[PDB]
Amino acid sequence: VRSMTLGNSTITTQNVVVGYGEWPSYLSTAEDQPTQPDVATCRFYTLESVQWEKTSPGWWWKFPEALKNMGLFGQNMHYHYLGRAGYTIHVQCNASKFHQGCLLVVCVPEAEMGCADTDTTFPATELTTEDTPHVFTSDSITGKKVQAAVCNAGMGVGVGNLTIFPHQWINLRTNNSATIVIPYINSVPMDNMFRHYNFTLMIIPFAPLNFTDGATAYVPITVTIAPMYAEYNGLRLA
Amino acid sequence: VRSMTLGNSTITTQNVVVGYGEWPSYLSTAEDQPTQPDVATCRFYTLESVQWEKTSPGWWWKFPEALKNMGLFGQNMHYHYLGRAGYTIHVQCNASKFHQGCLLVVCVPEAEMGCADTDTTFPATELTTEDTPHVFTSDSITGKKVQAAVCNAGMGVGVGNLTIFPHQWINLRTNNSATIVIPYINSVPMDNMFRHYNFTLMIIPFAPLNFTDGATAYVPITVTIAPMYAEYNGLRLA
Amino acid sequence: VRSMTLGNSTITTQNVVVGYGEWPSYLSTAEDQPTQPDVATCRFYTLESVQWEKTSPGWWWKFPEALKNMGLFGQNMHYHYLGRAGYTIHVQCNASKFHQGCLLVVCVPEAEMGCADTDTTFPATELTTEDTPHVFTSDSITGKKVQAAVCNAGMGVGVGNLTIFPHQWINLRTNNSATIVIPYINSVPMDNMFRHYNFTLMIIPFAPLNFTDGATAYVPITVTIAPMYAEYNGLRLA
Amino acid sequence: FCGSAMATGKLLISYSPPGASVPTSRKDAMLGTHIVWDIGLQSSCVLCVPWISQSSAGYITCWYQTNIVVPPGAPTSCDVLCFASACNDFSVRLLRDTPFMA
Amino acid sequence: QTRHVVNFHSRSESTIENFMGRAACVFMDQYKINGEETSTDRFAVWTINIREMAQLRRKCEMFTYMRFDIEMTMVITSCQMPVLTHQIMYVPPGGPIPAKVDGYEWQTSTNPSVFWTEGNAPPRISIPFISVGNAYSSFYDGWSHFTQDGTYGYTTLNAMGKLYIRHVNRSSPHQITSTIRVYFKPKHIKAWVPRPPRLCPYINKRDVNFVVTEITDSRTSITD
């Protein structure tokens, strides 16, 4: 049991999957000069806990803008139009000893998702609802929204071989916590934080939750994101 | 947790009761020359799992010929008329945490058993059914078969003081696995493997199984035998 | 006179023609691992003696599967689907001093034989009858079987210049025994022992047997094969 | 094994060589290559199947050695996930077009 | 066929340059020589992108980011005269495009073009890594216009240019219909961030939309 603290946010934790074997880092020019906030920003932003029942198909969050209303990070998104960060993501499950199940906690950089009924697009509020997650579906759906059927998560790939990305299994038999570090994967050193979704944290239950008639009918999944090494553009003159 | 392997048979284990403080060994003459198979023979031969209910009185297997249909050992019994082995015997129980009970896992060399109705004998198929175990009985029985009543296991002795032999208690409160090594006890260095039963692995529940109306109505007992240091007679000329 | 012994098989012999100047050898990877039997397999497998009269045109055996019912070699053919061996082949003739004749004992790797009436194939039981040899014929034959006329042995070549292969002459005037060692000639390191016939031991009488009205009307030819350096695939996990 | 932390049982994972026939019974699978995988101790058993190539293959069957023993509180039916990758190193030669795309 | 001992140890064919760097025909198109002075059927266009045919698109979607020089060689035919000379004008991402076969854009000095006459070896034109960013992005989970406007999934970083092709001969007595086959080839290719293979069939050449497809082919029972 390790009680991590960052700034004015302390969580209680119980091995880290460093995404692509690199730890996030700063970009290191007088023509373009970055600003490193360091203060705040790096604290833990615990999202709303998500109840995982027997019939839950999955969830996804789209970062960096899932934190668009989360304190100083969410506020520096509005004053700087360029930025980058690292996002340590803790995912606890705090189930009991008699619950069973298994989760895939994967980050999937550049998850371009497909519309439900092709030949058209979706109204941009279907990919993300800031803090709250968009759930997947168990079967096919229609309408101007994301094709959120599992087995074809979002991108038209098989959902089983979604393990190529930075992932972590949460098998309630053995463990309960996951932690992933995603060192800002992008083709340009800095990019706008409202246009571009750098990665898509999606939690997908492979083995479904199961229990008997006495336990709690759900297992709350807690998501915590710590934006590390966030740096922005300069606002001062040169 | 130790994952033992022998040949092409791997089991998963969780202290060894070396029978009579000796480890089995080879016999070490040109007038009579033994053959040491070594290859195969020594692999783990897992018998059929045995369900242990609340009303189970016990079981017994008679070796070496309990393995008479078990691969190369069971086949070398038919080509060589003399042999000897060591037989490491693992006995798991893989019950739950809410089950309770206790077993006596004892080997009893030279278990000459008595007929049910004396003044006669039994038809030789009542001592052994190769792989499958003959159960004991809770009370007295009649007919031309083995007097299989517990409290007088097979030999007319008290079943409580059957602890003089190489034994191991399996108390489901504490442990689940037993392992016994029986270094070929016999009065002649080699003997035929179909006439003579060198020992009798009998598992006897002293404290009966108990559980509530939600658990599984049984506890499967898994028996695994590894014939060690098996050697046979010679078939070649001199 | 040398009394060779291998395992539990001793023959009595009276110069070796090492095929292509190489002695058989083992293949020397964890992705594919061979098993070397060594035990048995290497013993002498004496085939049925073949009576050679004045009108015998010849014989052929197709190996490795001529030994498909020959003990442990013949049994390892069924459990392993890949293998290789060396096959020391002794060929005695034990004729008298007044018999005369001459044999060509040749091995002919990759003897693809032709059908008797072309435009069709043969039913696969005409190439080989395991232990027993298919005889040649003195003239042309028809039907769905092998064109077994000598002067065109099996392959459409001249039978006189069949001496290019590993061969040995058995001239009853001088010698009686032949021995050939064939170091597994094949284009792949291991191959299935039922699909592919690695070589074809064919014994062809050039000078016919002759004798007077008092001698025995035949000369029994004894064939003995010792599979050397036989190795198979692995059956265990890695 | 994605079952409960209280469920306990044994599974027997047999491997048949690429030429051999499948085991029709549990005993015949025990006499070949197998691994009696105790679930209550470890929850993840790893194999490494060799001789995998093309240019009639093996079998990974699984058997009930014992049933799943479960306390009154935990559920009775469980699930087992499987995985697959290259064990140590993989060899591959002749590039072609994939059949899946039309 | 039969199962042979495939014994060798090599992964030189599995590298990225030996997997992606293969020339594939990505653009057939017709273009006349005479008639209809104001027509769009006297030249070819083909905006250069990896999402041309599904077989190569599938390979480009193994990886999220990749950068590579392209070296295309055209194979130009003709039907129905003099000896014909062609022009294959590559315009960069920032470049004017012709509207007609006789536009002034064809004479732009910043648009490199090859003048291949018929009968010789095929014309080969090589284009370096043009993109503004540091790699071409196969997938772009983002919006081109800020504040979640239209045009999802289209970034302007992975723009490669266009390829305008015409006859340079002003006219002809009869009709000549030329056919061009552009052979695209990645070169000096690097690739980052692997990605699971495509499962569903492709719908359209500018989006990732799909129909929900089964994972694998079905069998009867779990044990057969």
3-state secondary structure string across chain A: CECCEECCEECCECCCEEHHHCCCCCCCCCCCCCECCCCCCCCCEECCCEEECCCCCCEEEEECHHHCCCHHHHHHHHHCCCEECCCEEEEECCCCCCCECEEEEECCECCCCCECCCCCCCCCCCCCECCECEECECCCCCCCCECCECCCCCCCECCCCCCCCCEEEEECCCCCCEEEECCCCCCCCCECCCCECCEEEEEEECCCCECCCCCCCCEEEEEEEECCCCEECCCCCC
Tokens for D28, please give them. Answer: 């015949």
Rounded to whole angstroms, the Cα distance separating B105 from B203 reads 5
B139, B149 in Cβ contact below 8 A? Answer: yes
> Cβ E3–D54 below 8 Å, yes or no?
yes
Rounded to whole angstroms, the Cα distance separating D40 from E107 reads 78
- D→A contacts (Cβ < 8 Å), by residue, are 1-7, 43, 71-75, 77-79, 81
Which chain D positions have a beta carbon within 8 Å of E5's beta carbon? Answer: 53
Which chain C positions have a beta carbon within 8 Å of E2's beta carbon? Answer: 192, 195
C104, C169 in Cβ contact below 8 A? Answer: yes
Domain B1-238 has CATH 1.10.510.10: no
**Cross-chain CB nearest to D43 (options A97, A171, A212):** A171
> Cβ B49–D41 below 8 Å, yes or no?
no
Tokens for C230, please give them. Answer: 């036989």
E3 touches C at CB < 8 Å: yes
Distance (Å) from the alpha carbon of C8 to chain B's nearest alpha carbon: 5
Q: What are phi and psi of A5, to 5 degrees?
A: -140, 140
Q: How was this structure determined?
A: cryo-EM
Nearest to B91 by CA among B229, B221, B190, B214: B221
Rounded to whole angstroms, the Cα distance separating A167 from A155 reads 17
List the chains bordering chain B where 3 or more Cβ pairs fall under 8 Å: C, D
**Cross-chain CB nearest to D71 (options B44, B98, B218):** B98
C-alpha distances in angstroms, D80 versus B12, D1, D11, E117? 18, 4, 11, 66
A62, A127 in Cβ contact below 8 A? Answer: yes
> Cβ E5–C189 below 8 Å, yes or no?
yes
| Residue E20 host element (H or E) | helix E17-20
Tokens for E69, please give them. Answer: 């020089």
Tokens for A228, please give them. Answer: 């590390």
Nearest to A66 by CA among A8, A19, A133: A133
Distance (Å) from the alpha carbon of B194 to chain D's nearest alpha carbon: 21
Which chain A positions have a beta carbon within 8 Å of E132's beta carbon? Answer: 188
Q: Which amino acid is at B162?
A: L
Distance (Å) from the alpha carbon of C190 to chain E's nearest alpha carbon: 6
Q: Which residue(s) pair with C149 in the sheet? A: C137
Tokens for E182, please give them. Answer: 């552009």
Nearest to C168 by CA among C221, C111, C112: C221
Nearest residue on chain A to E149, judged by CA atoms? A124
Which chain B positions have a beta carbon within 8 Å of D32's beta carbon? Answer: 8
- Omega of the bond prior to D23 within 30 degrees of 0, cis? no
| Residue C221 host element (H or E) | strand C219-226
Distance (Å) from the alpha carbon of C9 to chain B's nearest alpha carbon: 9
For residue E16, what is the DSSP state? S
Cβ neighbours for E50, distance < 8 A, ≥ 6 positions apart? E56, E57, E60, E136, E138
Q: Residue A122 half-sphere exposure, CB side, CA atoms within 13 Å? A: 24
Nearest to C184 by CA among C14, C15, C18, C7: C18
- C→B contacts (Cβ < 8 Å), by residue, are 7-8, 39, 235-237
Residue E155 CA, distance from chain mean position: 17
**Cross-chain CB nearest to D36 (options B12, B98, B213):** B12
> Cβ A151–E150 below 8 Å, yes or no?
no
Which chain D positions have a beta carbon within 8 Å of A99's beta carbon? Answer: 4
Number of C-beta neighbours around residue A190 at 10 A: 18
Nearest residue on chain E to A113, judged by CA atoms? E208
**Per-residue exposure over E64-96, b if at least 16 CB sit within 10 Å of its own CB, e if not:** bbbbbebbbbbebeeeeeeebebbbbbbebeee
C-alpha distances in angstroms, B223 versus A69, B45, B59, B208? 61, 8, 11, 19
Nearest to D88 by CA among D54, D52, D57: D52
Which chain E positions have a beta carbon within 8 Å of D57's beta carbon? Answer: 3
Nearest to A200 by CA among A115, A137, A108, A124: A108
Question: Which domains are seen in chain E, by residue range?
Answer: 1-224 (2.60.120.20)
Which chain B positions have a beta carbon within 8 Å of C236's beta carbon? Answer: 7-8
Which chain D positions have a beta carbon within 8 Å of C235's beta carbon? Answer: 17, 32-33
> Cβ E3–C32 below 8 Å, yes or no?
no
Rounded to whole angstroms, the Cα distance separating D36 from D12 reads 4
- The H helix count followed by the E strand count for chain D is 1, 3
For residue C35, what is the DSSP state? B
Rounded to whole angstroms, the Cα distance separating D14 from C236 reads 11
How many beta-carbon contacts under 8 Å exist across B and D? Answer: 96
> Cβ C8–B39 below 8 Å, yes or no?
no
Distance (Å) from the alpha carbon of B12 to chain C's nearest alpha carbon: 16
> Does B23 belong to an annotated binding site?
yes
| Residue E60 host element (H or E) | helix E54-60
The sign of the torsion formed by the CA atoms of A72, A75, A79, A82 equals positive
Tokens for C14, please give them. Answer: 């009276």
Residues making up chain B, counted from first to last: 238
**Cross-chain CB nearest to E212 (options A127, A140, A155):** A140
